[PDB]
Structure 1
Amino acid sequence: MDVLYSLSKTLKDARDKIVEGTLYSNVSDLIQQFNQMIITMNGNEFQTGGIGNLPIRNWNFNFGLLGTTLLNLDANYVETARNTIDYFVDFVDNVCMDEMVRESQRNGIAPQSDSLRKLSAIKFKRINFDNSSEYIENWNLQNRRQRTGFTFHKPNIFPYSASFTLNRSQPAHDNLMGTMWLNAGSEIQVAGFDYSCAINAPANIQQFEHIVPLRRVLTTATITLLPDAERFSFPRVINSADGATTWFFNPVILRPNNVEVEFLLNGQIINTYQARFGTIVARNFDTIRLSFQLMRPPNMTPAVAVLFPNAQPFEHHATVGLTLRIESAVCESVLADASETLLANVTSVRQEYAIPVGPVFPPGMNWTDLITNYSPSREDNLQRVFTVASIRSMLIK
Structure 2
Amino acid sequence: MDVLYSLSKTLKDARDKIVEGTLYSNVSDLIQQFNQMIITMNGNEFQTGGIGNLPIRNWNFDFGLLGTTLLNLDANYVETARNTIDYFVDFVDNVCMDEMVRESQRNGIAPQSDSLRKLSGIKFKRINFDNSSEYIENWNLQNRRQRTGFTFHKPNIFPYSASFTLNRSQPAHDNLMGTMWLNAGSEIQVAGFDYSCAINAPANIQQFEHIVQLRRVLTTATITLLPDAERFSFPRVINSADGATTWYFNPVILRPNNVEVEFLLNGQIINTYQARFGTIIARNFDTIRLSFQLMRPPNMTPAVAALFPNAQPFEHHATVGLTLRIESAVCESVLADASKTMLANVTSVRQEYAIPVGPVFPPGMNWTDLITNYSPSREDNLQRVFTVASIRSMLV
Question: Aligned to 2:323, what secondary structure does the other structure show?
Answer: strand
Question: Aligned to 2:215, what secondary structure does the other structure show?
Answer: coil
Structure 1 residue 64: deviation in Å?
A: 1.6
In 2, Cα distance between the equivalents of 1:10 and 1:98?
20
TM (normalized to structure 2)? 0.98
In 1, Cα distance between the equivalents of 2:55 and 2:132?
32
Q: Does 1:369 align with 2:364?
A: no
| Cα pair 2:251 2:316 within 8 Å, conserved | yes
Q: Which moved more, 1:174-183 or 1:306-315?
A: 306-315
Aligned to 1:295: 295
In 2, Cα distance between the equivalents of 1:86 and 1:149?
34
Question: Aligned to 2:311, what secondary structure does the other structure show?
Answer: coil
Q: Which moved more, 1:379-388 or 1:29-38?
A: 29-38
Q: Deviations over 1:201-249 (max 9, x none)?
A: 1121111111110111010011101101111110111111232211111
Q: Which moved more, 1:379-388 or 1:90-99?
A: 90-99
Q: Deviations over 1:334-387 (max 9, x none)?
A: 111010021111111110010010011111110001111110000000000000
In 2, Cα distance between the equivalents of 1:109 and 1:268?
32
Structure 1 residue 71: deviation in Å?
A: 1.4
Off by >2 Å, runs of 4+ in structure 1 = none
Compared with structure 1, are the counterparts of its residues 242 and 121 closer, same or farther at alpha carbon in structure 2 (3 Å cutoff)?
closer
Q: Deviations over 1:288-329 (max 9, x none)?
A: 111111111111111122221112211111111211111111
Q: Size of the alignment, in residue pairs?
A: 396
Q: Does 1:4 align with 2:4?
A: yes
Q: Deviations over 1:105-135 (max 9, x none)?
A: 1111111211111111112112212111111
Q: Deviations over 1:22-53 (max 9, x none)?
A: 11112110111111211221111111112111
Q: Which moved more, 1:381-390 or 1:313-322?
A: 313-322
The root-mean-square deviation of aligned C-alpha atoms, in Å, is: 1.0
| Equivalence map 1:128-277=2 (5 Å) | 128-277=128-277
TM (normalized to structure 1)? 0.98
| Cα pair 2:196 2:311 within 8 Å, conserved | no
Question: Aligned to 2:129, what secondary structure does the other structure show?
Answer: coil
Question: Aligned to 2:360, what secondary structure does the other structure show?
Answer: coil
In 1, Cα distance between the equivalents of 2:300 and 2:121?
79
In 1, Cα distance between the equivalents of 2:72 and 2:273?
64
Structure 1 residue 282: deviation in Å?
A: 2.0
Question: Aligned to 1:64, what secondary structure does the other structure show?
Answer: coil
Q: Greater share of strand residues, 1 or 2? A: 2
In 2, Cα distance between the equivalents of 1:350 and 1:387?
15
Q: Which moved more, 1:207-216 or 1:375-384?
A: 207-216
Question: Aligned to 2:216, what secondary structure does the other structure show?
Answer: coil
Structure 1 residue 13: deviation in Å?
A: 0.7
Aligned to 1:72: 72
In 1, Cα distance between the equivalents of 2:120 and 2:284?
38
Compared with structure 1, are the counterparts of its residues 75 and 242 closer, same or farther at alpha carbon in structure 2 (3 Å cutoff)?
closer
In 1, Cα distance between the equivalents of 2:163 and 2:375?
23
In 2, Cα distance between the equivalents of 1:311 and 1:39?
86
In 1, Cα distance between the equivalents of 2:39 and 2:305?
88
In 1, Cα distance between the equivalents of 2:301 and 2:65?
89
Unaligned runs of 5+ in 2: none
Question: Aligned to 2:202, what secondary structure does the other structure show?
Answer: coil
Question: Aligned to 1:279, what secondary structure does the other structure show?
Answer: strand
Q: Deviations over 1:132-175 (max 9, x none)?
A: 11111100010001111101100010111211001111111121
Q: Which moved more, 1:38-47 or 1:336-345?
A: 38-47
Aligned to 2:118: 118
| Cα pair 2:155 2:327 within 8 Å, conserved | yes
| Cα pair 2:342 2:389 within 8 Å, conserved | yes
Structure 1 residue 192: deviation in Å?
A: 0.5
In 2, Cα distance between the equivalents of 1:77 and 1:296?
79
Aligned to 1:331: 331
